[PDB]
């Protein structure tokens, strides 16, 4: 899935020291002294959209070509990947 | 993951764009756009944006629930949420 349980080893314990240090910046509680991080530790790998790839059958100078073009997500920046032909119609 | 889209203006526009970019590299001479025909396929590309971490941390003998985010590209980290005290898991 998207969720995964991790070891409470060092990297994790160091995630703990960060939490408290940032908590101390806020100070909602006392001057929190870091003790330890315990099981369970949940890690959510966040997947988002980078943009797309379009596959075309396009007729150029009456010749059937297959165009592979990409487009970026937030910028709509498009780039032509491949362009071969002529190719058999589908 | 794979998607089929119609061949409307948007898609024809994609075709006008493609040819025009081929004219630049000109591996097939000067080509003139006619039309884009079925089928049109669209693939969505997903990349990792970063991570969220759910921790159970002890602070001054108090058990808290902390949520941190960490950013893929930059390793940048932020404390989303810090509540407590909370009963042991």
Residue numbers in the entry:
A (entry chain A): 2 to 91
B (entry chain B): 3 to 91
From the manuscript:
Here, we engineer the hydrophobic QVVAG hinge loop from the domain-swapping cystatin, stefin B, individually into the β-turn-β motifs of the single chain variant of the sweet protein monellin (MNEI). In domain swapping, two protein molecules exchange “domains” or structural units connected by a hinge loop, such that intermolecular interactions replace the intramolecular interactions at the dimer interface of each monomer. We show that introducing the QVVAG motif into three different surface loops of MNEI results in domain-swapped dimerization, generating topologically-distinct domain-swapped dimers of MNEI. We then show that engineering the QVVAG stretch simultaneously into two different loops of MNEI creates two swappable domains in it, resulting in the formation of a double domain-swapped dimer.
A mutant variant of MNEI (L1MN) having a shorter loop1 carrying the stefin B QVVAG motif in loop1 was designed, expressed and purified. The crystal structure revealed that L1MN forms a symmetrical domain-swapped dimer. The two “subunits” of the dimer exchange “sub-domains” β1-α1-loopA-β2 and β3-loop2-β4-loop3-β5. Individually, both the subunits retain the fold of monellin, and superimpose with wt MNEI with a root mean square deviation (rmsd) of 1.2 Å. However, the conformation of loop1 is different in L1MN and wt MNEI. In contrast to the β-hairpin conformation observed in MNEI, loop1 exists as an extended β-strand in L1MN. Several van der Waals and hydrophobic contacts are formed between the QVVAG segments of the two polypeptide chains in the crossover region. Moreover, symmetrical hydrogen bonds between the two QVVAG segments result in the formation of a new anti-parallel β-sheet between the two polypeptide chains, which further stabilizes the hinge region. Thus, a significant secondary interface is present in the L1MN swapped dimer.
